[PDB]
Structure to design on (158 residues):
């Protein structure tokens, strides 16, 4: 059984919220690191200095922490995830 | 070289030095850059004036010390 509800929004006015904090976990993006507006940072991702994350990347570490090193790039449309074990 | 162009250049340079030393683009806030130029010019001018005054009030005291030494005989 499926039923509609009026709480649904057919136009999320605010946008995408590129940085999604999960409780106390916050995406620690460093200055001088390029993160495109389309990129979604969720969970506990950490982007270090000199790095770059390109549009379409869906970096999320809600299961385990994910890290990007110095001057290392994650190109476009790259989905990075983590597991418990 | 007029103790003000050097001061303004040094203030602007230290503003970009502080700004880029935190790993930020050099011209983040232009307003603090211009106020840094002003502060550098003011400090350079005051440093020159203070140097002139220091020499002026040091000569008149070294002369007194030498005169006090010269009364030995
Ligand atoms: C750190 C980087 C250094 C990079 C540059 C190094 C090169 C430095 C030379 C640049 C420079 C500025 C110094 C900048 C300091 C930087 C401050 C840093 C912090 C800034 C954020 C110093 O150049 C002169 O300054 C004189 C000051 O005394 C000194 O001359 C000796 O002083 C005698 C004292 O007794 C000695 O007895 C004697 O032997 C020398 O005569 C010497 O230092 C030098 O000749 C330019 O000269 C400036 O000083 C004076 C005289 O020209 C001018 O003001 C004058 O004021 C009235 C009477 O004062 C005058 O009526 C008026 O006409 C004039 O306006 C300035 O307008 C400007 O010309």
């Amino acid at each position: 059984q499926v039923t509609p509800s009026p709480d649904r929004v057919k136009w999320d006015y605010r946008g995408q919220r590129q940085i999604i904090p999960l409780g106390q976990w916050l995406p620690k993006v460093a200055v001088d690191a390029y993160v495109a507006p389309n990129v979604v940072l969720a969970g506990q991702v950490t982007v270090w200095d000199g790095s770059s994350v390109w549009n379409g990347a869906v970096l999320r570490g809600d299961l385990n922490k994910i890290t990007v090193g110095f001057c290392s790039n994650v190109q476009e449309r790259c989905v990075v995830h983590a597991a418990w074990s | 070289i007029s103790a003000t162009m050097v001061g303004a250049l040094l203030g602007l340079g230290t503003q970009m030095y502080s700004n880029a030393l935190r790993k930020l683009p050099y011209m983040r806030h232009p307003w603090e850059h211009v106020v840094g130029m002003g502060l550098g010019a003011v400090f350079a001018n005051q440093l020159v004036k203070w140097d002139v005054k220091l020499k002026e009030d040091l000569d008149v005291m070294l002369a007194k010390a030498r005169a006090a030494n010269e009364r030995r005989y």
Notes: The interface with chain A takes residues 22-25 of chain B (CB under 8 Å). The pocket of Lauryl Maltose Neopentyl Glycol is lined by residues B 1-3, 6-7, 10-11, 40, 43-44, 47-48, 51-52, 55 (CB under 6 Å).
